[PDB]
Design a protein around this ligand. Structure first.
Ligand SMILES: [Mg+2]
Length: 612
């Protein structure tokens, strides 16, 4: 043979590179600092393609490049930003000299193995890395297969070693989809925004025009929040009436009965119902029922659900939750937290994972019992073919993780244990009473077996007194018949969880970009985070959405954005053309831009009134 080949391997972050290399080298790792200070280099000897080679594992630091125009406060025509103005990739963090670092460590290498995180974003970074390293590689084995791509979902021995055993190739289609989204959002975003910042610059005393922006995704996202605001302001409470009766059992208990008609919105018919029941002194039992029912254990955890719970229960904003989750993934405590999958792959050792939790004080006894009783089969969920559900991959304590990391890990773990636990079994009981012509019911739940609600106590069935045993035909003295007059209540501002659900429902913010957009409209102070993590539109945010809507509703409605993202996903699947999707979309929004500029009065008028 000739010279021993050197295999360069690149992960997305320094910690990832170190951990992966430590696993693959079985601890025979030799590490030294790179030129940039951020990135280290991990070297060791091993085997590749049945041959002894030298391994050289390092990393980048997230995206190497960001898309920008070719060449701030300078005088350019926003209309030119659609087609004329050229765009080019620039280093996302120039001080790190990432391209130079890759060239230096990648020089003279024969093979490259890509260990970037496995999403479309990661595939895009693959070609960032390849663009830097390929020109500097050794030319010897230059006509061989020199580029490899590892696929993995967790930084664990099992998943990382298997990745090496079945190396694939980087997906250029998925990489192109990321590029296309970046270029679309940059051009369309800056065009509509820069026009307004200049147009309104110093125009009104109480308006800092630099606060105005448009985004093909962030604006519809804000649109949802402002829509709720509008519903709240225009809400008209309605009076309604509820008939309720109280009954005395044989064991001298007051049963509160629920009206079969539940409620009424007519004053006269309400008075009519009260009159025909208030004098009745006896309630006849017409029917009884006992039904064993199940409160199901949760579906396996996906990203969208994690974000809802982290917000609603843990008080973490979507971006805060994602970075916390990503850090957990980085240290190998959970699987990759960007997934739509709610279905456990068949190969996955669930009992093994459960066994890992058998020693934590909070659920050791619960887990041990489950291992003795035998694990339940998780519910069949959805397999999006991206990653497994977000699952604990390693045991942990609050000492190891710290505040935010532990709180998120505890939920992910408790949620997991529940998926492999049993359903909650309870008794649903009902009694039907006849009072005059009117029907009434009283209901009650009795827990038979807690099931998963032991490890998830917040989903437990509330303790209620068992309904009295009685027979059809039995009669109870009516203790009281009253009619409640009530008022319908307005909705509250959108919670982050509701917004997440809305964005998922309308198909915007796909590929886990939802937390970015939500954080964006918060960072721009278009909404404020109020108690219960509610998103209350600010004055400017309201004005902006109303302004955009008056000019062109399609700028605010998620319809257009949803279709674009579907087109972008088709690029990723190789079912749509990169350049054609770019061209068509940019044409559509260029047309809307010119209409926007012509109809700017729709925005200006609202701006004048609100900001003098
Ligand atoms: Mg990434």
């Amino acid at each position: 043979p000739g010279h021993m080949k050197t295999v360069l391997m690149v992960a997305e972050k320094p910690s990832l590179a170190q951990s992966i290399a430590k696993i693959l080298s079985r601890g025979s790792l030799s590490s030294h600092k790179g030129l940039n200070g951020a990135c280290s280099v991990h070297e060791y000897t091993g085997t590749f393609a049945g041959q002894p080679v030298r391994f050289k594992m390092t990393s980048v630091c997230g995206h190497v490049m960001t898309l920008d125009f070719l060449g701030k406060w300078d005088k350019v025509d926003p209309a030119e930003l659609f087609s004329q103005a050229p765009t080019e990739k620039k280093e996302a963090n120039p001080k790190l000299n990432m391209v130079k670092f890759l060239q230096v460590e990648g020089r003279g290498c024969d093979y490259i193995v890509l260990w970037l995180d496995c999403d479309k974003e990661g595939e895009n970074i693959c070609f960032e890395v390849l663009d830097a390293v390929l020109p500097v590689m050794n030319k010897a084995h230059g006509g061989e297969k020199t580029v490899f791509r590892a696929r993995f979902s967790s930084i664990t021995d099992t998943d990382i070693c298997n990745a090496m055993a079945c190396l694939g190739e980087p997906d250029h289609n998925e990489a192109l989809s990321v590029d296309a989204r970046q270029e679309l959002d940059l051009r369309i975003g800056c065009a509509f925004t820069r026009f307004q910042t200049k147009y309104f610059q110093g125009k009104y005393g109480d308006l800092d025009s630099s606060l105005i922006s448009f985004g093909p995704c962030q604006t519809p996202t804000l649109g949802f929040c402002v829509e709720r605001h509008d519903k709240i302001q225009s809400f008209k409470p309605e009076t309604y009436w509820v008939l309720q009766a109280k009954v005395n059992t044989d064991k001298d208990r007051s049963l509160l009965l629920d009206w079969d008609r539940v409620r009424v919105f007519d004053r006269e018919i309400a008075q009519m119902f009260l009159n025909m029941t208030k004098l009745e002194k006896e309630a006849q039992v017409e029917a009884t029922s006992r039904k064993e029912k199940a409160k199901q254990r949760p579906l396996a955890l996906n990203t969208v659900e994690m974000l809802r719970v982290a917000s609603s229960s843990l008080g973490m904003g979507p971006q805060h939750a994602m970075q916390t989750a990503e850090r957990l993934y980085t240290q190998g405590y959970i699987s990759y937290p960007r997934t739509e999958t709610t279905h456990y792959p068949e190969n996955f050792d669930l009992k093994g994972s459960l066994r890992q939790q058998a020693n934590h004080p909070y659920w050791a006894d619960t887990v041990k019992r489950l291992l003795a009783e035998g694990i339940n089969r998780p519910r069949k969920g959805h397999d999006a073919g991206d990653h497994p559900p977000i699952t604990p991959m390693k045991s942990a304590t609050e000492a190891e993780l710290g505040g935010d990391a532990w709180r998120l890990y505890e939920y992910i773990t408790r949620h997991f244990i529940a998926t492999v636990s049993h359903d909650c079994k309870y008794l649903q009981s009902t009694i039907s009473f006849r009072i005059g012509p009117e029907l009434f019911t009283c209901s009650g739940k009795t827990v038979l077996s807690p099931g998963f609600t032991e490890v998830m106590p917040w989903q437990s069935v509330p303790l209620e007194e068992s309904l009295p045993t009685c027979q059809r035909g039995d009669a109870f003295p009516v203790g009281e018949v009253k009619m409640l007059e009530k008022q319908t209540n307005p909705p509250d501002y959108l919670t982050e969880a509701e917004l997440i659900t809305l964005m998922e429902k309308h198909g915007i913010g796909t590929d886990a970009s939802i937390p970015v957009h939500i954080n964006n409209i918060c960072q721009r102070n278009y909404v404020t985070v109020e108690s219960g993590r509610r998103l209350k539109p600010t004055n400017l945010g309201i004005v902006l959405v109303h302004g955009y809507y008056k000019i062109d509703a399609e700028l605010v409605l998620p319809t257009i954005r949803s279709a674009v993202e579907k087109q972008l996903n088709l690029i990723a699947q190789g079912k749509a053309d990169y350049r054609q999707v770019l061209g068509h979309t940019l044409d559509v929004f260029k047309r809307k831009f010119h209409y926007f500029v012509d109809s700017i009065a729709g925005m200006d008028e609202l701006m004048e009134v609100s900001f003098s």
